[PDB]
């Protein structure tokens, strides 16, 4: 078994791409790229696509559990929210790509213990004004789940205690509820 089988991930994941085109509605700009459910298929996908730092501004990547679309409207996102990492323009060079890949591995490696079931997915927004990365969770009222994912996330990105990150509900997005 060991010699020849791919290594299965706990979940099947879908990678999505967004390109800003003012000709189209936001949802029409959102497109699914492919899915994978093994370590080896993840790295084949990742190794084939552009680093976030190399995308034109206005683009997003999103990685979500199969069955969950990367949009507020989805039943598993409507009552939820996101842990938000805001980066300055200098961090495009220094942090964007490494932070995004760490976010990817927190999801597929199920890095948040009993609360990895609350995880829906993650998004990186590439923007001239300042890039963003976020982990989306499914229920903004689940205080223990949300806070625990926030603490683990902050430390896995190696952020200092001088930084604070915020959790915002999509309901208000469409203010911070929690900070760690
Ligand atoms: C995650 N998400 C994002 N959006 C859309 O993206 C925007 C929200 O994201 P955020 O607050 O980060 O803004 P951002 O992504 S930094 O966009 P931006 O301000 O850089 O965009 C530049 C300009 O272009 C406009 N824009 C942005 N995306 C699109 C677009 O896809 N199509 C058109 N026609 N115009 C667009 C936007 O209104 C702005 O004036 C909202 O704009 C509109 C089109 C009104 O819908 C929102 C969403 N819409 C829905 N229904 N559901 C979502 O989950 C969702």
Curated annotation (Swiss-Prot):
Substitution effect: residue 129 to E: Abolishes binding to the 4ESE element in mRNAs
Keyword DNA-binding found: no
Binding site residues for mRNA: 26-27, 72-73, 127-132
Highest taxon above the source species: Eukaryota
Record GO cellular component, one term: cytoplasmic stress granule
PTM (free text): Phosphorylation increases the ability of the protein to bind to mRNA caps and to form the eIF4F complex. Phosphorylation also enhances its mRNA transport function.
One term of GO molecular function: translation initiation factor activity
Its job: Acts in the cytoplasm to initiate and regulate protein synthesis and is required in the nucleus for export of a subset of mRNAs from the nucleus to the cytoplasm which promotes processes such as RNA capping, processing and splicing. Component of the protein complex eIF4F, which is involved in the recognition of the mRNA cap, ATP-dependent unwinding of 5'-terminal secondary structure and recruitment of mRNA to the ribosome.
Protein name, UniProt field: Eukaryotic translation initiation factor 4E
Species name: Mus musculus (Mouse)
Lineage: Eukaryota, Metazoa, Chordata, Craniata, Vertebrata
């Amino acid at each position: 078994p060991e010699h020849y089988i791919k290594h299965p991930l706990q979940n099947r994941w879908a990678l999505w791409f967004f390109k800003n085109d003012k000709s189209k509605t936001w949802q029409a700009n959102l497109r699914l790229i492919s899915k994978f459910d093994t370590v080896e298929d993840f790295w084949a996908l990742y190794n084939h696509i552009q680093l976030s730092s190399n995308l034109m501004p206005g683009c997003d990547y999103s990685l979500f559990k199969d069955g969950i679309e990367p949009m507020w409207e989805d039943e598993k996102n409507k009552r939820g929210g996101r842990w938000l990492i805001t980066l300055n323009k200098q961090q495009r060079r220094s942090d964007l790509d490494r932070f995004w890949l760490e976010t990817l591995l927190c999801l597929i490696g199920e890095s948040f213990d009993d609360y990895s079931d609350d995880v829906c997915g993650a998004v990186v927004n590439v923007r001239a004004k300042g890039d963003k990365i976020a982990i989306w969770t499914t229920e903004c009222e689940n205080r223990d789940a949300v806070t625990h994912i926030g603490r683990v996330y902050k430390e896995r990105l190696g952020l200092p205690p001088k930084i604070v990150i915020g959790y915002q509900s999509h309901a208000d997005t469409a203010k911070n509820r929690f900070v760690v």
